[PDB]
Amino acid sequence: GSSGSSGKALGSKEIPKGAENCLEGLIFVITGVLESIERDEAKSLIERYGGKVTGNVSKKTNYLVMGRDSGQSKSDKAAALGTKIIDEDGLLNLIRTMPGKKSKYEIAVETE
């Protein structure tokens, strides 16, 4: 047999059409697992816009992507340093709410 999703099975969510550098410079911390997307999937996203993804809370951390079976220590520290905690949903919106920038070089056929 075989349980769980084989791949990304994209479809149980909607990717916001924003800018390419709307998250460039910002850092994100994904903890636990998320149905919509896996630590990898969601990660590739934040990075696809410039944002960073690290499984550790830092002073540079801009936002903390929470999920399930996650610890409460991550939040505590996050708040202390002053990090905005959000869920997979909040991350997506940040892609439609955040502004955009003009990269030095554009990549053609930039579509799925």
Curated annotation (Swiss-Prot):
Coiled coil: none annotated. Residues 18-108 form the BRCT domain. Wide tissue distribution. Undetectable in placental tissue. It is found in: Nucleus. Belongs to the activator 1 large subunit family. Large subunit of the RFC complex, an heteropentameric complex consisting of RFC1 and four small subunits RFC2, RFC3, RFC4 and RFC5; the RFC complex interacts with PCNA and the interaction involves RFC1. It is linked to Cerebellar ataxia, neuropathy, and vestibular areflexia syndrome: An autosomal recessive neurologic disease characterized by imbalance, cerebellar ataxia, impaired vestibular function, and non-length-dependent sensory deficit. Subunit of the replication factor C (RFC) complex which acts during elongation of primed DNA templates by DNA polymerases delta and epsilon, and is necessary for ATP-dependent loading of proliferating cell nuclear antigen (PCNA) onto primed DNA. This subunit binds to the primer-template junction. Binds the PO-B transcription element as well as other GA rich DNA sequences. Can bind single- or double-stranded DNA. This is Replication factor C subunit 1. It comes from Homo sapiens (Human). The lineage of its organism: Eukaryota, Metazoa, Chordata, Craniata, Vertebrata.
